[PDB]
Amino acid sequence: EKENITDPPRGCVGNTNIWKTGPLFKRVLMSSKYADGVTGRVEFNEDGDR
Amino acid sequence: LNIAVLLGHSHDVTERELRNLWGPEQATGLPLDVNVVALLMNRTDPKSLITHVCDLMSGARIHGLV
Amino acid sequence: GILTTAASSMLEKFSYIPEAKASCYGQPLHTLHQFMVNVTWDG
Amino acid sequence: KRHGSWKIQLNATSVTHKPNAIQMALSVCEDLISSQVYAILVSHPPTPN
Numbered sequence: 001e002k003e004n005i006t007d008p009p010r011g012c013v014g015n016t017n018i019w020k021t022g023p024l025f026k027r028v029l030m031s032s033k034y035a036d037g038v039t040g041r042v043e044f045n046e047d048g049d050r
Numbered sequence: 051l052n053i054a055v056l057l058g059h060s061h062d063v064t065e066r067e068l069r070n071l072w073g074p075e076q077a078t079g080l081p082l083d084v085n086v087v088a089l090l091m092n093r094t095d096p097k098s099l100i101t102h103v104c105d106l107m108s109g110a111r112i113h114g115l116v
Numbered sequence: 117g118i119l120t121t122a123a124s125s126m127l128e129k130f131s132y133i134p135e136a137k138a139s140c141y142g143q144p145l146h147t148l149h150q151f152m153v154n155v156t157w158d159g
Numbered sequence: 160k161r162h163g164s165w166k167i168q169l170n171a172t173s174v175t176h177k178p179n180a181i182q183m184a185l186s187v188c189e190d191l192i193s194s195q196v197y198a199i200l201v202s203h204p205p206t207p208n
């Protein structure tokens with residue numbers, strides 16, 4: 001939705017070009033608020049757990 | 051013992067002074083089969099770190115990594 | 117210097133302190149972790 | 160199905176058991192960094208180690 005497309009490059013050959021949206025997509029992991037799931041209502045807390 | 055010493059790319063340090071930093075030094079050398087292997091690296095990746103660790107561990111029983 | 121000091125002062129206790137692993141593929145007792153708590157090199 | 164009509168696609172890659180634990184992450188790195196993956200999930204209870 002909010003574009004900012006960053007890609008993890010091929011670090012196997014001499015690359016330390018870090019991925020910029022590392023924490024930011026982790027923010028997407030922190031704000032992954034859902035309610036659909038066979039296990040139940042899946043939602044991540046401040047600890048990143050169920 | 052056999053100790054491998056590898057470095058990155060900073061400080062422009064070449065390799066021969068690393069050979070000579072061990073040789074005339076260690077006056078009180080009590081173990082006999084002590085040898086250093088001074089190497090460098092052309093990359094900055096953990097892939098080559100895994101590769102050179104698995105090659106130097108098989109490389110005549112290296113017991114030290116720096 | 118610390119590595120050679122540890123190998124020298126641990127050689128006097130047990131002989132075959134060098135105990136390396138053969139290869140990473142295809143899957144010890146005397147270590148220096150409990151030995152170099154305190155060591156001295158060149159003062 | 161329900162995630163719009165954008166031209167994004169998906170590809171699957173799953174790596175299996177190796178008895179040596181270093182070569183596990185070795186197969187992972189050379190098979191997924193070259194694949195440019197975005198998430199990594201491990202689902203192995205029945206290991207003897």
Ligand SMILES: *[C@@H]1O[C@H](CO)[C@@H](O)[C@H](O)[C@H]1NC(C)=O
Nearest residue numbers: 001002003004005020021024
């Ligand atoms: C994307 O992120 C950059 C900073 O990395 C920022 O300058 C830019 O405004 C962002 N674009 C938007 C608004 O999505």
Ligand SMILES: *[C@@H]1O[C@H](CO)[C@@H](O)[C@H](O)[C@H]1NC(C)=O
Nearest residue numbers: 035037038039040041042043
């Ligand atoms: C957890 O509890 C309910 C109880 O009926 C269960 O049906 C469902 O699997 C779970 N739902 C939620 C709220 O996660």
Ligand SMILES: *[C@@H]1O[C@H](CO)[C@@H](O)[C@H](O)[C@H]1NC(C)=O
Nearest residue numbers: 065088089090091092093098
């Ligand atoms: C230079 O890089 C190549 C490729 O990894 C390697 O084979 C060679 O040993 C490297 N040389 C040094 C001294 O780092």
Ligand SMILES: *[C@@H]1O[C@H](CO)[C@@H](O)[C@H](O)[C@H]1NC(C)=O
Nearest residue numbers: 125150151152153154155156
């Ligand atoms: C380390 O210090 C302890 C006392 O804290 C001492 O007993 C011991 O001799 C020292 N280590 C050596 C030289 O073995």
Ligand SMILES: *[C@@H]1O[C@H](CO)[C@@H](O)[C@H](O)[C@H]1NC(C)=O
Nearest residue numbers: 168169170171172173174194
């Ligand atoms: C897509 O996945 C298949 C099976 O895992 C793999 O063989 C292929 O290299 C992947 N990449 C492409 C070309 O999309």
